[PDB]
Design a binder for these strands. Structure first.
Lengths: 145, 145, 145, 145
DNA sequence: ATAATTGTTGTTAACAACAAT
DNA sequence: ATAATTGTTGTTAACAACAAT
């Protein structure tokens, strides 16, 4: 089913989900930073999720896009505390009110400019809900050294 | 300040919170049905909680009132599972995004036409959230038999 | 839906379920002795249930009957330990593998000869799985004083 | 007597129990997938457990062998929920109706064609209970890719 | 006076969190 | 050397059990 999640992400964000994240083949592996793509997200929840995640993220950047074929939202989360994909998954599958199957979770791609610019580009749009000091790895890669 | 609540609730709904709830002097005492009074509830979170609770309630009724003195909402919850105030306090605190301090929890006053009518009347405004088969106790005491 | 459970019990056992049990209007009320009518019971489970309940009943009498219109089984359980309808319900809904809705639980009718004879009559058939010393109240009422 | 088990299992299945399970030295360590070796299992309870587990497993495979030396069954369980041996020990003990002593529990040996084939071979006898989508790990290691 | 009703207290699955390689 | 992997340990919903009227 990923085939679709992925395909929809592309047509919606003009780039592969892979392009912005690095792989974690184990669901039990704990991490602080996470990239989340949510399909079929309800406006109200998306709104809530923001206010809610603030309470436990050093940084958080939420973005939602959509059209007739589908709707998707990407989250660049930075939990104050390391979380496994499971934990993150469980937590979010609920906070957002979508079956787990409507989620895509992989740790961000840090070393990579194409990637850094994705987050930077986003942060430029107003619609994007932002909270926190733009992460180190993104600036360090998108600044005139 | 519980008094300032009761008062506010009274001020807002026009009848002591006591007139619709039966005493439970133990936070560890579990029950399926509960009556919730929430104070300072964010518009969004109210809307959210409703869609979210549906996943775990057999019956749910929500009303929210306010004015230039404060905002307060009421819940008549019938959890599919029994839960101690301890639990509901936790669940609803984080769900509504408020301090445990902003919540009043006691099981409904099931036997007593007056109260039983409260929900009836409430179930008459379109600006109210309904869900599930209206409770036997509430139904009986308010229909010609 | 009880209407059916009941109706099926009759056509299957030639008597009302009420005829053999006394009412408990509260599900949280604990009791040792229980009468159970299970609809849609699977042979294998019915068999198992026997062996399983033995481990925790001073007495137990199981009986299963059926036909095209439906199938039903009655249990006269005597838990070594007092159990609420809930507890009993939860326990059995699972041990038997039927939704709760396929259960009927009420404490037996002790003072009553028509009732005593039901259990006695049953215990006379071979098919009936029996375990334990026939309860006091049944003998005391079905013996030549 | 664990040795008498292993031996019996070996005697019964023709290959060390070790050849299909990965070490977990902590009963409190939780996991979704488990391999169960049960000894002295009542015909009925085996049949029952299968229909019963289906309610809580994404994949399940059961085989039961015996001779004039003893009886032993094997389970490849993939619980929808993670469970420590502690838990499964309890759950399966009471479900199969045997002392904790009659159970051997270790997570499967997922990486290793040999073992991976065990289930494959096993999935070739009609006298075996199947349920759900055969596991990625088992599938991969045994199909032309 | 049977039960309806809460107290009140253990036990334990379902998890998060994190040490440790 | 990143993660994949279990240890290992709290916290707490989901309950049974039972005191008490």
């Amino acid at each position: 089913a990923t085939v679709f999640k992925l395909g929809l992400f592309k047509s919606l964000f003009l780039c592969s989900f892979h392009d912005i994240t690095r792989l974690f083949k184990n669901d039990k592996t704990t991490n602080q930073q996470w990239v989340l793509a949510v399909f079929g997200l309800a406006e109200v929840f998306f709104e809530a999720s923001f206010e809610l995640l603030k309470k436990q993220c050093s940084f958080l950047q939420m973005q939602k896009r959509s059209h007739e074929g589908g709707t998707c939202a990407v989250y660049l989360i930075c939990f104050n505390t390391a979380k496994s994909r499971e934990t993150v998954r469980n937590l979010m599958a609920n906070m957002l009110n979508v079956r787990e199957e409507c989620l895509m979770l992989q740790p961000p791609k840090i070393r990579g400019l194409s990637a850094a610019l994705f987050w930077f580009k986003s942060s430029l749009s107003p619609a994007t809900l932002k909270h926190g000091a733009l992460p180190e790895w993104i600036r360090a890669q998108t600044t005139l050294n």
